[PDB]
Structure 1
Amino acid sequence: SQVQSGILPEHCRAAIWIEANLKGDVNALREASKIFVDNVATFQAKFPDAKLGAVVAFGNNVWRQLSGGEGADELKDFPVYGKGLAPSTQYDLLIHILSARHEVNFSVAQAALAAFGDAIDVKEEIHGFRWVEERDLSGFVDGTENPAGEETRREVAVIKDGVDAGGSYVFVQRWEHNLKQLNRMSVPDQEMMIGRTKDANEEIDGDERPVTSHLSRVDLKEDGKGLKIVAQSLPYGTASGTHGLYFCAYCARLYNIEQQLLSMFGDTDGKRDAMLRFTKPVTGGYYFAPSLERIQALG
């Protein structure tokens, strides 16, 4: 079984995320998905220098219908966390395109919309870009450097065995930064908020940083083993309007993502991520990315 091309690539410079709801018969998504993954291969042959990859992923209700309720045991609608601090905007379909060339991404997105046609109603389209020094617009690194290498990324992100082998669970969440609130904080205070130094990205010891620091919120272990994810997040937005981070993560278990979200949004020990002092999430959704063989078998 073969993983979809957009899950594991590293160092993408640009991405497009499209979120949409089904219109009408769910079975129309079968042929559209097949056309789209075939389009991706065609684009890869035409634009080898793009290093293009893409993912099509499905929300709970639609995937249960398409799969006859088989597998994807952990999949569910984004449930809201923090009594609303992390809202749910769950849709039926996610298209994630990433590469070294925004212009190729755009062409692929057009081909995706043409393949699904009237079977979908688009609700969100975000264009991500890698910023200077691979930093988040906060000035801290963007959180996607690790894990490095195909081998470890495959271990963290890709289901190993069973009917779902080669698949992955996907989480997307758009954040809106308020850089005016951020820049009122001294850099040392920002570093206690994140849990690493800002310029050199040197980790601050857990015993020396507050429990509300982002790293204390999301660096979680179970029986001494870290709950890791493969992040594909990128900055987005305009300088004079809305901007922030489009957070995107792939994982072989949704459990890892949920545990980090429960910790960040006050549903574990009661503490909340200190990053909420300058940025907030405004979307949230969970999706299942099947293997390429599984998509081809839809019809």
Structure 2
Amino acid sequence: GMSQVQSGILPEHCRAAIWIEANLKGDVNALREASKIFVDNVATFQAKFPDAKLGAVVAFGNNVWRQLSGGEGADELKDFPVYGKGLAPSTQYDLLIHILSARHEVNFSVAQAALAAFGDAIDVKEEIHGFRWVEERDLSGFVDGTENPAGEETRREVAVIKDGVDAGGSYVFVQRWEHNLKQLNRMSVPDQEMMIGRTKDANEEIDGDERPVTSHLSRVDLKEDGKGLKIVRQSLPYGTASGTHGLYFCAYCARLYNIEQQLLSMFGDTDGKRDAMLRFTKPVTGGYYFAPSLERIQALG
């Protein structure tokens, strides 16, 4: 009588991922059988490739999740708002598929199985292939992940809903950033470090009273009476060297509130100041999704 989390939320250090964002074209009932087929395919791929340490998540947008759930649970779920009156655009879609493992080839086969399961009931809007870069660096050259929740126990505490109808579920936020590395390279390495809030090569935290309030860490390291608003990030670099490249931002949280507070801070809604990373990179997509527990994907129908 308990709930099982979807396999793609908790895994750490996965070197590769595939994110598919899509709109529902047909009847919402088509997503019920397709989701059951896909979670079945993920279990089949895990049995065939045990050393891939494969995980996947199927998550739903506000409109379609209210229909599938009959309005029960997922109290915080809503369409992703525009933050900063436009600084963070909104591209809310109906379905999110997140696949992650140690092997891109296996993720690609799993992505093909997801497309075969949903078929022509969906319209694919985005497909991004994430890759861990050297020293787990973001393409800017700064290490991405140091203060991210560590170990299964703390990651469950931060990302997984504990009780009630949504037990085992999680809220997902996805946002694709396009880096302008030419604009970053014009900045001196000390100016870049003040923009992030950590040193570049050694990845040391700059003290809060020594770094600007617009620094990335000052915008997102938020506390409410000493309790941090933590999230489980699964972001990865993406793109081509000569074309579009940047960071595909992805985060899971048991409460959508923690993610929203960080976005209100970053995009100027809380105190009128915005994230210094906006001098070289910009978000171009944005969406909120609800990832139900595994047994509630089996109860669809």
Q: State the TM bucket, normalised to the shorter chain.
A: over 0.9
Structure 2 distance, partners of 1:201, 1:146, is: 14
Distance in 2, Cα, partners of 1:144 & 1:39: 33
Secondary structure of the corresponding residue to residue 205 of structure 2:
coil
1:9 aligns with: 11
- Once residues 134 and 24 of structure 1 are traced to their aligned partners in structure 2, the CA distance between those partners, rounded to angstroms, is 40
Give the structure-2-normalised TM-score. 0.99
Q: Which of residues 152, 163, 168 is equivalent to 1:166?
A: 168
SS in 2 for 1:245: strand
Question: What does the per-residue CA deviation read over 1:249-276, in whole Å, with 9 as the maximum and x for residues that have no partner?
Answer: 0000000000000000000011000000
How many angstroms apart in 2 are the aligned matches of 1:291 and 1:200? 39
The change in CA–CA distance for 1:107 and 1:160 in structure 2 (over 3 A counts) is same
Partner Cα separation in structure 2 for residue 261 and residue 143 of structure 1: 18
Distance, in Å, in 2 between the alignment partners of 1:197 and 1:26 is 48
Q: Offset at 1:110?
A: 0.1
- In 1: Cα distance, 2:296 partner to 2:75 partner: 16
SS across alignment from 2:85: helix
Is contact 1:43-1:108 (8 Å) kept? yes
Deviations 1:49-105 (A, max 9, x none): 110000000000000000000000000110110111100000000000000000000
The separation in 1 between residues aligned to 2:76 and 2:255, in whole angstroms, is 7
Write the distance in 2 (CA, Å) between the matches of 1:25 and 1:275: 41
For 1:247, the equivalent position in structure 2 comes to 249
Q: 2:56 aligns with which of 54, 59, 64?
A: 54
Equivalent position SS for 1:19: strand
Q: Is the 8 A contact 1:16 1:127 kept in 2?
A: yes
* Deviation by residue 1:9-50 (Cα, 9 ceiling, x = unmatched): 000000000000001110110000000001000000000111
What CA RMSD, in Å, does the superposition of the two structures yield over aligned residues?
A: 0.7
In structure 2, C-alpha distance between the alignment counterparts of 1:241 and 1:196, rounded to whole Å: 28
C-alpha deviation, 1:144, in angstroms: 6.1
Q: Is the 8 A contact 1:175 1:246 kept in 2?
A: yes
Aligned CA distance change for structure 1 residues 102 and 257 (closer, same or farther; 3 Å): same
Where 1:156 maps in the other structure, the secondary structure is helix
Q: What displacement does 1:178 show?
A: 0.3
Deviation at 1:146, TM superposition (A): 2.0
1:109 corresponds to which residue? 111
- 1:206-231 Cα offsets, whole Å, 9 max, x none, are 00000000000000001210000000
Out of 213, 220, 223, the residue aligned to residue 221 of structure 1 is 223
Using structure 1 for the length normalisation, give the TM-score. Answer: 0.99
Aligned partner of residue 65 in structure 2, secondary structure? helix
Equivalent residue number for residue 183 of structure 2: 181
8 Å Cα contact 1:144/1:232 also seen in 2: no
> How far apart are the structure 1 equivalents of 2:249 and 2:230?
15
Q: Does 1:296 align with 2:292?
A: no
Q: Which residue of 2 aligns with 1:66?
A: 68
1:198 pairs, out of 190, 197, 200, with 200
Question: Aligned with 2:177: secondary structure?
Answer: strand
Could you report, residue by residue, the CA deviation over 1:174-202 in whole angstroms, capped at 9, with x for unpaired residues? Answer: 00000000011000000000000011110
d(CA) in 1 for partners of 2:147 and 2:215? 19
Assess if the C-alpha contact under 8 Å between 1:57 and 1:93 holds in 2.
Answer: yes
TM-superposed CA distance for 1:145, in Å, is: 5.7
CA–CA distance in structure 1, aligned partners of residues 123 and 147 of structure 2? 34
Contact 1:144 1:231 in 2 (8 A): no
Confirm or deny: 8 A CA contact 1:144 1:233 kept in the other structure: no
The 1:92–1:144 alpha-carbon spacing in structure 2 relative to 1, beyond 3 Å, is: farther
Note closer, same or farther for the CA distance 1:171–1:199 as it changes in structure 2 (3 Å cut).
same
Runs of 4+ in structure 1 deviating by more than 6 angstroms, as ranges, are none
Q: 1:144 to 1:293 in 2, by over 3 A?
A: farther
Residue 144 of structure 1 contacts residue 230 of structure 1 at CA under 8 Å; is this kept in 2? no
How far is 1:143 from its partner? 3.1
Contact 1:229–1:249 (CA<8 Å) still a contact in 2?
yes
Contact 1:22 1:121 (C-alpha < 8 Å) held by counterparts? yes
Aligned residue among 143, 146, 154 for 2:145: 143
User: Any conservation in 2 of the 1:169–1:287 contact (CA below 8 Å)?
Assistant: yes
5, 20, 44: which one aligns with 2:22: 20
Name the SS of the counterpart of 2:98 in structure 1: strand
